[PDB]
Design a protein around this ligand. Structure first.
Ligand SMILES: C=C1C[C@]23C[C@@]1(O)CC[C@H]2[C@@]12C=C[C@H](O)[C@@](C)(C(=O)O1)[C@H]2[C@@H]3C(=O)O
Length: 154
């Protein structure tokens, strides 16, 4: 049933800094990284592990939705893997019936890190809508990761 797309990016920042930003500090880092997109992010419930509930509030007028609620579905500190599944809003209002993003961080050297991006998705329509193809949604993820790199290196 579930379709999967993978890509990779390499960022010139170290593993621990990236992993902290993407996990325990996500709610304060994301608005600083994406100040023209994300107004704020809250932890609704949970400690950061599986089943933690997050809400991302967006600036209106950019996308067809002004929030997304996410739930953590994987949290592995040894492999530095975190998965976020959309619960409400987000791409569920744009043509998909299921969406999840999983990041896995691997050190290349002290200040260079490989980021694997896995996008899992489904849609009810016989043909997928263009704006929610993973080739397109991954572009936004890569935009974010590059902005995260820029934020951490400052
Ligand atoms: C530019 C982006 C990329 C977002 C969607 C957004 O439009 C704004 C917020 C990004 C993001 C930030 C943190 C998480 O990595 C993510 C999966 C999410 O929920 O929100 C990230 C998410 C994504 O990678 O799909």
């Amino acid at each position: 049933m579930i379709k999967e797309f993978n890509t990779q990016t390499t960022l010139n920042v170290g593993l621990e800094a990236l992993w902290a930003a993407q996990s325990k500090d996500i709610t304060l880092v994301v608005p600083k990284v994406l100040p023209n997109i994300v107004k704020d992010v809250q932890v609704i419930e949970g400690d950061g592990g599986v089943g933690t509930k997050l809400i991302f509030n967006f600036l209106p007028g950019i996308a067809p939705v002004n929030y997304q609620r996410e739930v953590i579905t994987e949290y592995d500190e040894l492999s530095h893997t975190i998965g976020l599944q959309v619960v409400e809003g987000g791409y569920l209002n744009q043509g998909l019936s299921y969406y999840k993003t999983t990041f896995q961080f691997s050190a290349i050297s002290e200040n260079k890190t490989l980021v694997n991006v896995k996008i899992s998705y489904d849609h009810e329509s016989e043909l997928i809508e263009e704006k929610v193809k993973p080739t397109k949604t991954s572009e936004s993820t890569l935009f974010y990761l590059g902005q995260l790199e820029k934020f951490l290196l400052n």
